[PDB]
Homo-oligomer: A and B are copies of this chain.
Amino acid sequence: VPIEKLQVNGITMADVKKLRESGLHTAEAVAYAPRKDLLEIKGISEAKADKLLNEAARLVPMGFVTAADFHMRRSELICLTTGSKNLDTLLGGGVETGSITELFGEFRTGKSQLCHTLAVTCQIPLDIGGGEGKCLYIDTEGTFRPVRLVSIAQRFGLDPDDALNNVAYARAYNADHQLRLLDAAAQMMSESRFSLIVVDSVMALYRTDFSGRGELSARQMHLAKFMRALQRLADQFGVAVVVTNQVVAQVDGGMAFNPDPKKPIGGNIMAHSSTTRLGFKKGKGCQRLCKVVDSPCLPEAECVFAIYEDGVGDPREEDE
C-alpha cells in the first residue's frame, strides 16, 4: 500500500515527505512503526502522529483474523525456487517470501551461490517458482559475482541484460552503512516491485565493527535493529529475505554431544530473528548438504544439492 494514501484528515504532503525521509515509505511502514518512533521524527506532533497511526490502521488491517483466513492467505504466498528440486522439497516449495531465511555455514558451502541462484530466480515467471520481481542484493564481503547471475539466467532463459538490470546491488562497508542501506531499499521498493532481499553476509561487518565483550551488547542491539528493519521490509513488501551467516568452531568441549563444532554467528539475536535457518555442509566435490535447523513448519530434515556453473541444481548421477 502506497504511503501517499495517508494524505487525509489534515495530513499534508510535508508530513508524508518527512516520513519518507525517515525511512518509512509505505502505509505498512507507518502502521508497524511504534508511536515513539513517529514522535522521534522531527516536525511531527503527538496528535498528528496519532491520526497517522489511525489512518494506517484503517488502511492496513492491524486487528485479529481467523486462522483459516491466514492459512488461505499463506496458501497464495509466493515461494521462490532455489534451482534444486531436492532443496525445494526440503523447504516445502522453496524460499518463502515475507519471512527471513538464514543460510549459515562454513566457506564454499554454496550460501553465496544459492543467493545468486535466488537472485536470478526471483525474476522468472511465477509458474516456474519465480517471483516476477527485481532482486535487491546487499553485499558485505565483496563476494558478489555478476558472471554467476549471467550463467544462471542463461540456465533459466532470462536475458542477461534484463537479469543484471533487475538486480539491485549495494556494497556495505560498515554496520552503520549496512543498516542505512535498508532505508534506500525501502525507497526503491516503494517505486518498483521487488521480490527478494539478500544480505551476504549480515554478521561479517558486525564481527569487526564491534570488538570485545564490552561492545558485544551494542553489537547485538544493532543486529536486532537490523533484522527488525529486515522483518518490517518483508512484511511491507512481501519480499523473501535471505541472509547468510558465518560460523565459528565451538571451542568449549563440554557439549561433546554435538557432532558439529560450528555454530552460526549473531547468537540468540540472529537465532530468534531468523524465521528459517538452513545449515550448509560440504559434500563430495560439488555436493552440498543443507539441513533445516530452525523452521516453524518445516521438519528438521537434510537434503543434498550441488553447485554447477549454471547455479545451484540437483546432484547429478555422474556426481554420485
Mark A residues whose CB is within 8 Å of B.
Answer: 31-37, 62-71, 74, 98-99, 106-108, 112-113, 135-137, 141-150, 161, 163-171, 173-177, 181, 184-185, 188, 201, 204, 207-209, 211-213, 216-217, 221, 224-225, 227-228, 231-232, 234-235, 246-249, 251, 254, 257, 259, 262, 267-269, 271-275, 277, 283-286, 293-297, 299-300, 309
| Pairwise interchain contact A168-B208, C-beta atoms closer than 8 A | no
A85 to B308 Cα, complex, angstroms: 24
| Pairwise interchain contact A275-B204, C-beta atoms closer than 8 A | no
| Pairwise interchain contact B204-A272, C-beta atoms closer than 8 A | yes
Q: Which residues of B contact A273 (CB under 8 A)?
A: 141
A277 to B283 Cα, complex, angstroms: 18
| Pairwise interchain contact B247-A268, C-beta atoms closer than 8 A | yes
A66 to B48 Cα, complex, angstroms: 37
A254 to B211 Cα, complex, angstroms: 20
Given A71-B147, A184-B63; A112-B296 close (CB under 8 Å): yes
| Pairwise interchain contact B271-A188, C-beta atoms closer than 8 A | no
Which of A36, A171, A268, A272 is most buried by chain B, counting CB atoms within 10 A of its CB? A272
A203 to B162 Cα, complex, angstroms: 43
| Pairwise interchain contact A67-B107, C-beta atoms closer than 8 A | no
A165 to B65 Cα, complex, angstroms: 9
Nearest Cβ on chain B to A256's Cβ, whole angstroms = 11
| Pairwise interchain contact B67-A268, C-beta atoms closer than 8 A | no
- Which of B62, B181, B208 is close to A64, meaning CB atoms less than 8 Å apart? B181
Nearest Cβ on chain B to A31's Cβ, whole angstroms = 7
Q: Which residues of B contact A145 (CB under 8 A)?
A: 74, 296-297
Nearest Cβ on chain B to A264's Cβ, whole angstroms = 10
